[PDB]
A = this chain, B = another copy of it.
Amino acid sequence: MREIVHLQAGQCGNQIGAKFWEVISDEHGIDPTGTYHGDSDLQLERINVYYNEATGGKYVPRAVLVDLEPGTMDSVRSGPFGQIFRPDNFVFGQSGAGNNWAKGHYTEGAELVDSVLDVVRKEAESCDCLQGFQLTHSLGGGTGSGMGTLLISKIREEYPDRIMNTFSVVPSPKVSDTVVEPYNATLSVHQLVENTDETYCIDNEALYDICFRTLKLTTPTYGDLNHLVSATMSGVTTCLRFPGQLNADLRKLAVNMVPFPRLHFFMPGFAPLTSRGSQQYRALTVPELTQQMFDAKNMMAACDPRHGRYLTVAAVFRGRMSMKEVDEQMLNVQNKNSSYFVEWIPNNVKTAVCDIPPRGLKMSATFIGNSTAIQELFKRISEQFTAMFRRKAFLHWYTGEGMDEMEFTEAESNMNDLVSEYQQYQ
């Protein structure tokens, strides 16, 4: 009954949003035409969270699609689930950013934010009790990171007492897609720390590790990569849509999960991921879920928690599930791992259980983790940022849009202050 308004920005944000709306529609039994074709009654008890009513029992998603290049727009519309989105929700300009945060934030994205804020207000004021907003974008590009942070800074001023989740694809450690990526990522993280309630870091190299070692696939296309993260997003908010024995929505998690307002950078992970051959040799049981959940291989970011300390841990279980084994297993890992957990907070683990499992699966779980080990992601792109900035390179494409050179110095000084307060809370 507490609605969530979905926001997509950029090419990556629309390719991750198309698969996200495919897995939710399959979960609630919504066919690509728009009607409902299911077998249970609990699917329609809480469906207004993501869907709006229409004439004749048709359901439309509560999502907006923003991109400076309408090239990804046509691929989404021509897909298997492209006729379910509202045709007025597509917002698009004429010229792309071209992997430039300056163009996406100040020059090209400035005349499109007013046109898209009308549609955001139209979807938000039609909700009786709006829970909050949700944004899918990547820091890899110019319109996902450029006007994605512009939309964040206008939403926070208009709706201050709300919640807002960001699923940001932070740059890869080994091979990066963009040469000017340290400029786009440093200037966007600085915009994220004062204007976001919860942030999740998703790494493509971590997604490559899952599909190669844990899942044992040979052709991991981007559809298979986007299916893993869409399962995480549905599993985070499963207590809102489906009844359970211990319920926990987004505000319930973030209170237990964020000790200080500068500590909102999490790391997700999906528990029941098995290979084809390994399926015949494994029984799904509660210790098996909590053993694969805490594994550093399974986690969806390029930071090893063995090098750091677990600050706070969240777990959201699904399916008809016991309670003693749930409490026993996440106590045993805390007692065994005496050094990986901080000592000035007792019982770092927060528990939530949902009753309805995903289709074809008996049990499932989702992991949210706050660690000091995520600061090595920030240090890696900060040293690359300072390596490019000393020689004054690649930034005549930045100061030629009006931006001064003092913005980079304050963006790094905020970022070195951000890594320095992760260290003394370790």
Interface residues of A (CB under 8 A from B): 34, 52-56, 58, 60, 86-88, 122, 125-126, 275, 277-284, 287-288, 291
Contacts and interface: CB of A to CB of B under 8 A. Distances in A.
Contacts of A52: 283
B122 A283 contact: no
Contacts of A284: 55
A37 to B, nearest CB: 17
Nearest to A121: B291
Contacts of A88: 275, 278
A34 B278 CA distance: 13
Contacts of A60: 281
A339 B58 CA distance: 37
Given A60-B281, A88-B278, 14 more contacts: A34-B280, A54-B280, A54-B281, A55-B280, A55-B282, A55-B283, A55-B284, A58-B280, A86-B278, A86-B281, A87-B277, A87-B278, A126-B288, A126-B291
Nearest to A284: B55
A316 to B, nearest CB: 24
Given A87-B277, A88-B275, A277-B87, A54 B282 contact: yes
| Residue of A281, A283, A284 with most partner-chain B CB within 10 A | A281
Contact of A287 (B54, B56, B126): B126
Contact of A281 (B87, B126, B277, B278): B87
21 contacts: A34-B280, A52-B283, A54-B280, A54-B281, A55-B280, A55-B282, A55-B284, A56-B280, A58-B280, A58-B281, A60-B281, A86-B278, A87-B275, A87-B278, A87-B281, A88-B275, A88-B278, A122-B291, A125-B291, A126-B287, A126-B291
Nearest to A332: B125
Contacts of A282: 54-55
Contacts of A122: 291
Contacts of A126: 287-288, 291
A283 B34 CA distance: 14
Contacts of A275: 87-88
Given A122-B291, A291-B122, A53 B283 contact: yes
A145 B224 CA distance: 43
Cβ-closest 4 pairs across A and B: A86-B281, A53-B283, A54-B283, A54-B281
A87 B56 CA distance: 49
A85 to B, nearest CB: 9
Contacts of A53: 283
A324 to B, nearest CB: 16
A286 to B, nearest CB: 13
Contacts of A54: 280-283
Contacts of A56: 280
A115 to B, nearest CB: 11
A279 B58 CA distance: 11
A278 B34 CA distance: 13
Contacts of A55: 279-280, 282-284
A283 B55 CA distance: 6
Nearest to A58: B280
Nearest to A87: B278
A353 B156 CA distance: 39
A283 to B, nearest CB: 5
A358 B265 CA distance: 56
A60 to B, nearest CB: 6
A119 to B, nearest CB: 12
Nearest to A89: B281
A220 B284 CA distance: 44
A322 B54 CA distance: 20
Nearest to A84: B281
Nearest to A277: B87
A278 B288 CA distance: 49
